[PDB]
């Protein structure tokens, strides 16, 4: 049974991995590095191929079309044969290794799939699996259309608001045909050619479009707004949060300020934050569907004391902490190292001997067979063996050092709370283990495909060998410089192939960033919930001073005015005054500067007095009314009362001092920093922001435990990094010097003009540069010489900003194998570790609103119950019959093709914004003329509706009201355009086309639900966004006083600095998106001799503050990026399951609701919205389809439905919502959909209806299809 034996089946899956490893070594560069690879890969491919062809013939010829795996195997043996036929030519004189024929090796790596073969009956039936997969596929397709709408919207806007970024400042000596690196400014910069419309170059310089000076598109670069094709590409790269601030600064220099500030900030808020959270919500609802489907589918005797005692456990734990701090403490110190037999090695051998003795005592006292069965003891054996190897003289400080630093893992037994949290969040290893394995297998297959696609270019590096390709694909996955990886390929592969590689990188980046990262979020959230049976069990089992008091507690002041009275009644009159004087004080502080302080300017000091004069009266009144802390109504209730009296004290102390000079590192400088806390009292005064702060701090214990895990990860990689890298990672400034004995004298250094704008040199020309001393130095942003420097470098790497600079510098200056350190830390910390905060914040948010305790069935029911409350009957009037003309116009305007041709015409008009609508280019005249023709077509379509139905009925629909308004603006633009022919009429033409382009979100049903999801999420998140802005003000005011005079540096420049509160706010928004915050921090850390100190005045010196920058930046990035922004994810995840809906035979769907609306709107003709009970028996006969109550067979359901509505109002009449809520309760499995409180009330009502209908059917004798499926279940149970 050659085929059938299980012993060959394991071999035939393991050897698939070897067939991937061989094709990862077929490359011209790895063959010229290692010639024997070309011979061993051929024989290793040949004898492998025999095994796969041997099963392929035997399974068809002896044991044997429709089986997908049989045709897959057949295609894969053909891939091996054509690979061998190519290789036996390429090794001969036939063809070389740099030929493009190697592209016939790109389908081979897909044999990675055979190695697994785990695709049959994984706990669930096929049909049940395909129901999950199709349901998630339609959700993903819906969000892809939604994304494409946004990408095209910002595309047509970018074309119209911005154009070509080609007006660089140039030294005038440049003639048209000689543009070179020496003709540019050194801090390379754009201008506006129009005066006052942007930046303009200083004397001795001028600006002109470098493309007209003979530069080509690949020399300028691909990023610009010249057409919708390039504009959609720049919109995508900007929406990825990768170099978006550089596009913003280029736009600020070339064009007006306001349009750049509006466009790029709103692009980030929508397309980066709010839209990506919808892809996260779709994958979370996919995990919710899975639980639905899983839930629905069903001497030696001292061993007794010495091993157990708290003394022995605490002694080993303190010896482990002592060993770890001793091991990490070996900082640089100097250039003297003697590591064959030295200090820090004797300690390590002594502690290694102690842990050997500990392990052997446990093994003796417990017995080896009883010891080895524990998972902790298996791990401690691995460390006891690995550190016994590490402390051998030839292996000390080698790659065995991981077994040394992993000793800190044992320390987790310190508190049961951290153990329980670890076991909770990582959960059953099977969920996270399969996802990290899938992530690795995907990345390995994709790097093998990119390798065989690009390795022969010979003008492109980074794809020449498998490790280079792997680093390139991993860099694209991690979101860092991914666009630079793509551009390096685009400018090397050539213009004929640039579109093909562009869509390849875009498709990989889409999947790797939208699906893979959201799967980690969904897995960690699914672990943080209870199991559905455990929450079911929990639910089942749980069942004159009185004048001052009157002054303090002052009284407050249809529906439109009631909402205003509610607002006015929000706080006491005194707290409204305190909100007002706090806000005017922050507005005064907005005008402060290092060159304009309140201490020297009475105009700003007026607000400083008013704040203290009002707040002293406030605190005195509240103290005289209710006391300090002696009663539950007193003023010092909690931290809010403590914060306000502290703010009052620092404010009063500053106002009575007003120090006329202030040194840069002084108590007066600290008091001026503490004065910037005033915006914080607005959180206390406004009760919605008190709620936001208390709901945020509900998670503090969980957030703290995640911080302890991340600090533990940073500490082991820092300890390893100090032991491996101290004194290395340092070299000469001169690229041509390889030894420290040669780092003397001076050399010519080449200055950075720009990393973009890739010009070629003329054959004899030098780059711009000057003469400089050569020295042996660390990099200025990370040095790896002590634990503090190592942990600071790892904290910066953890945020994924500059991590590529750290990677390349380790590879270059230490060695290639040390790449593993930085890649593993980025996977553990950035991919897994920071996702623990995302999970904890969203889980605690759902616990605050109580939905964490509900079953997925109950959550769906609650989201249906609100969706049916939001629902209304249709505004559409019935068709007229008094004349034939309005009757045929009603038919015509309702045809199912007419709706689609009108939707297509909106896209057809939107395409006229493909290129800038200026006034000088004659192509503007056809485009504007065509928009007039479209405008008349839409005037006619509005007329067809106005003659199909009454104008009074037409105007009830919001869509009709909006499309009428846009069409009125259209015909107004048409007459104005022909009257004036000016640039403002072309601008108004572009505006009305953009206004009409938004109409398609009212016509496509899934696009409407996704737009509503985002629009309501902006309303829901308002106080969270205001809370973040109050923190931006506190940090901006602190940054102006702390860094306002800092000398320009790596990133601190004219575009980014703290010279005013406005410039501080835009610099903080850069840091919120994360764009190079650490380069800026290292500029703000500057001290002598890089800056000029002053003895007693902070506005005189241009130095920074070292400890100030470390506290100011790290705190800002943690509280905003790791914590606050994750509430905006929770808000989108809340609203997506509410507003989005799909077809599902468990609930009342939007198809059922539309069918019910159409049938309601033929019984309620007069549109009163409330029907007499006499017509309910008629209404529930017309409901054919999935709502069908059959008159026959289902007579008891018919009588129930009639009697329920007749009982509800004791006859009379019935609203739309009462019939609709009867339909929902009569079409769900109430025994799992309802909560245990409302379930008893329903069942009691329905039992009363059973008794009454039984009484009526007795009395009338004595005198002489989801609804019916659910009725059958109920009748069967009762």
């Amino acid at each position: 049974l050659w085929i059938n034996k299980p012993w060959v089946h394991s071999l035939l899956r393991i050897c698939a991995i070897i067939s991937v490893i061989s094709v990862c070594m077929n490359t011209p560069m790895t063959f010229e590095h290692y010639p024997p690879l070309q011979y061993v890969t051929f024989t290793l491919d040949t004898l492998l191929m025999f095994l796969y062809t041997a099963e392929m013939i035997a399974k068809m010829h002896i044991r044997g079309v429709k089986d997908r795996w049989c045709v897959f195997d057949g295609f894969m043996v053909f891939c091996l044969w054509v690979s061998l036929v190519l290789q036996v030519f390429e090794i001969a004189d036939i063809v070389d290794q740099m030929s493009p024929w190697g592209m016939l090796r790109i389908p081979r790596p897909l044999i990675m799939i055979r190695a697994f073969r785990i695709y049959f009956r994984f706990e669930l039936p096929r049909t049940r699996i395909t129901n999950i997969l199709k349901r998630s596929g339609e959700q993903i397709w819906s969000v892809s259309i939604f994304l494409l709408f946004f990408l095209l919207l910002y595309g047509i806007l970018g074309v119209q608001m911005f154009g070509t970024f080609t007006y660089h400042c140039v030294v005038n000596d440049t003639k048209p045909g000689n543009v070179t690196w020496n003709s540019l400014a050194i801090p390379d910069t754009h201008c506006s050619p129009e005066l006052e419309e942007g930046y303009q170059c200083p004397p001795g310089f001028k600006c002109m479009d470098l493309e007209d000076l003979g530069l080509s598109r690949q020399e300028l670069g691909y990023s610009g707004f010249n057409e919708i094709g390039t504009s959609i590409f720049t919109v995508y790269e900007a929406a990825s949060q990768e170099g978006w601030v550089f596009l913003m600064y280029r736009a600020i220099d070339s064009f007006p300020r306001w349009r750049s500030y509006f466009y790029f900030i709103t692009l980030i808020f929508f397309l980066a934050w709010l839209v990506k959270n919808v892809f996260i919500a779709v994958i979370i609802e996919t995990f919710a569907e899975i639980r639905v489907q899983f839930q629905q589918m069903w001497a030696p005797a001292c061993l007794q004391k010495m091993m157990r005692s708290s003394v022995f456990h605490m002694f080993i734990l303190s010896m482990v902490t002592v060993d770890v701090i001793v091991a990490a403490s070996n900082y640089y110190k100097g250039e003297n190292f003697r590591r064959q037999y030295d200090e820090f090695y004797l300690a390590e051998v002594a502690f290694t001997v102690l842990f050997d003795l500990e392990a052997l005592l446990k093994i003796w006292c417990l017995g080896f067979t009883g010891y080895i069965s524990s998972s902790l003891h298996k791990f401690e054996l691995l460390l006891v063996i690995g550190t016994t190897l590490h402390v051998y003289p030839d292996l000390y400080h080698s790659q065995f050092t991981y077994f040394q630093v992993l000793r800190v893992v044992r320390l987790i037994k310190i508190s049961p709370a951290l153990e329980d949290f670890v076991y909770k969040i990582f959960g059953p290893g099977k969920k996270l283990g399969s996802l990290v394995v899938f992530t690795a297998s995907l990345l390995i297959v994709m790097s093998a495909i990119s390798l065989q696609m690009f390795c022969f270019v010979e003008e492109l590096d980074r794809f020449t060998t498998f490790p280079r390709a792997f680093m390139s694909m991993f860099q694209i996955l991690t979101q860092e410089g991914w666009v630079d990886v793509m551009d390096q390929t685009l400018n090397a592969v050539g213009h004929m192939w640039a579109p093909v590689v562009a869509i390849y990188f875009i498709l990989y980046h889409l999947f790797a960033t939208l699906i893979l990262l959201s799967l980690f979020v969904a897995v960690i959230l699914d672990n943080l919930e209870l199991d559905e049976d455990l929450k079911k069990l929990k639910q089942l089992k749980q069942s004159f001073r009185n004048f001052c008091r009157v002054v303090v507690r002052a009284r407050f002041n249809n529906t439109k005015y009631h909402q205003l009275y509610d607002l006015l009644g929000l706080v006491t009159y005194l707290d409204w005054v305190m909100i007002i004087v706090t806000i005017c004080s922050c507005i005064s502080m907005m005008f402060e500067s290092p060159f304009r302080r309140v201490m020297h300017a009475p105009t700003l000091q007026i607000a400083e007095y008013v704040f203290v004069i009002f707040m002293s009266i406030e605190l005195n009144l509240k103290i005289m009314a209710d006391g300090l802390f002696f009663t539950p109504t007193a003023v010092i209730r909690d931290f809010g009362g403590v914060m306000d009296i502290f703010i009052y004290l620092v404010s009063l102390i500053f106002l009575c001092w007003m120090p006329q000079n202030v040194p840069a590192e002084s108590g007066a400088q600290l008091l001026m920093v503490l004065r910037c806390l005033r915006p914080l009292r607005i959180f206390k005064l406004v009760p919605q922001m008190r709620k936001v702060v208390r709901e945020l701090f509900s998670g503090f214990k969980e957030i703290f435990l995640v911080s302890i895990l991340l600090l533990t990860l940073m500490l082991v990689f820092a300890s390893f990094g100090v032991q491996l890298f101290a004194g290395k990672l340092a070299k000469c400034n001169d690229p041509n010097i390889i030894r420290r004995e040669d780092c003397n004298g001076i050399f010519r250094i080449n200055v950075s003009v720009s990393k973009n704008l890739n010009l070629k040199l003329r054959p004899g020309e030098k780059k711009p540069g000057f003469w400089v001393p050569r020295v042996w130095a660390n990099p200025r942003n990370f040095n790896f010489d002590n634990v503090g420097n190592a942990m600071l470098a790892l904290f910066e790497v953890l945020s994924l900003k500059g991590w590529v600079e750290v990677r390349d510098v380790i590879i270059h200056r230490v060695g290639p194998i040390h790449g593993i350190y930085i890649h593993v830390f980025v996977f553990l910390g950035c991919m897994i570790g920071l996702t623990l905060f995302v999970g904890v914040v969203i889980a605690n948010f759902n616990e605050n609103k109580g939905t964490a305790l509900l079953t997925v069935d109950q959550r769906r029911w609650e989201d249906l119950k609100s969706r049916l409350k939001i629902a209304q009957p249709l505004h559409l009037p019935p068709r007229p019959d008094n004349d034939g003309f309005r009757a045929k116009m009603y038919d015509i305007t309702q045809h199912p093709f007419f709706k689609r041709t009108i939707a297509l015409l909106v896209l057809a008009q939107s395409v006229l914004l493909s290129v800038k609508w200026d006034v000088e280019d004659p192509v503007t005249v056809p485009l504007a003329t065509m928009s007039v023709v479209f405008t008349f077509i839409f005037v006619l379509e509005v007329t067809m509706k106005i003659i199909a139905m009454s104008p009074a009925g037409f105007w009830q629909s919001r869509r009709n009201r909006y499309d009428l308004l846009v069409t009125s603006l259209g015909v107004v633009w048409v007459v104005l355009h022909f009257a004036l022919l000016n640039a403002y009429t072309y601008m108004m033409g572009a505006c009305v086309i953009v206004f009409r382009f938004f109409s398609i979100c009212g016509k496509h049903v899934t696009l409407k639900m996704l737009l509503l999801t985002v629009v309501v999420s902006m309303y829901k998140s308002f106080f969270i966004i205001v809370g973040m802005f109050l923190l931006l003000l506190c940090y901006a005011f602190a940054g102006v006083v702390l860094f306002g005079t800092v000398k320009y540096g790596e990133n601190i420049n004219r575009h980014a600095n703290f010279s005013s509160a406005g410039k501080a706010i835009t610099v903080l928004f850069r840091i919120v998106t994360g764009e190079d915050w650490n380069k800026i921090m290292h500029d703000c850390m500057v001290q002598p001799p890089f800056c000029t100190p002053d003895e007693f005045t902070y506005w005189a010196t241009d130095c920074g503050n070292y400890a100030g920058a470390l506290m100011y930046f790290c705190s800002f990035y943690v509280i905003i990026a790791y914590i606050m922004l994750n509430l905006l994810v929770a808000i989108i995840v809340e609203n997506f399951s509410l507003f989005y809906s799909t077809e599902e035979d468990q609930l009342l769907s939007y198809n059922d609701l539309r069918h019910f609306q159409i049938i309601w709107n033929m019984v309620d003709d007069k549109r009163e919205g409330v029907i007499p009970t006499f017509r309910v028996k008629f209404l529930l006969r017309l409901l054919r389809g999935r709502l069908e109550v059959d008159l026959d067979k289902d007579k008891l359901l018919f009588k129930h439905m009639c009697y329920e509505m007749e009982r509800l109002h004791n006859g009379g009449d019935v609203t739309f919502h009462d019939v609709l809520s009867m339909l929902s309760y009569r079409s769900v499995d109430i025994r799992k959909s309802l909560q245990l409180e409302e379930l008893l009330a329903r069942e009691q009502l329905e039992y009363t209806i059973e008794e009454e209908v039984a009484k009526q059917t007795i009395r009338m004798w004595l005198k002489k299809q989801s609804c019916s499926i659910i009725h059958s279940l109920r009748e069967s149970q009762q």
């Binding site: 000057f770 003469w771 001393p773 942003n781 990370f782 800056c1091 506005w1099």
Partner: protein, 182 residues
Amino acid sequence: ARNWSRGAAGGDGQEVRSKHPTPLWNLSDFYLSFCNSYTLWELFSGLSSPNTLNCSLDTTCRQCVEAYQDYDHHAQEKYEEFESVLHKYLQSEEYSVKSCPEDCKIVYKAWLCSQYFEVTQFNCRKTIPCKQYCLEVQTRCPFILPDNDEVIYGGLSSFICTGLYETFLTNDEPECCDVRRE
């Protein structure tokens, strides 16, 4: 007598603008043509590759005057490349509160001259160890970013004079003169 200041002879001293007019004489004070703080006295007292002191005053080894004029010329050519880079640095009016590009090009000129002539200076009232001009440049000049191509410069500027805790200003004190306005 005075520092070079302004004028070809009014300061009771001149510059060696020509090779041949100094075969003999008696008092050494002729200043250079670009590195104006250095006279022939401290130059011949220092180190010259072709020949040394005394054979100068005795014609026979005058070839050293042309060697100093050649060094003075190379020091000027390297200075031009710096001040054209500084001219093309468009943020020279705003990068610092106390610094000015005038101060920068003074202290960088003094640094280039102390690189080409490592000789001591004296009798100018104001003296300073020549290694201080590295710290003047790193304090008073712009942050110019080097071209990351082969070497990745991880945030360091083009001009720096110290690394890995090496000793500096170690009392070697090559006495230079304080040739700066502030």
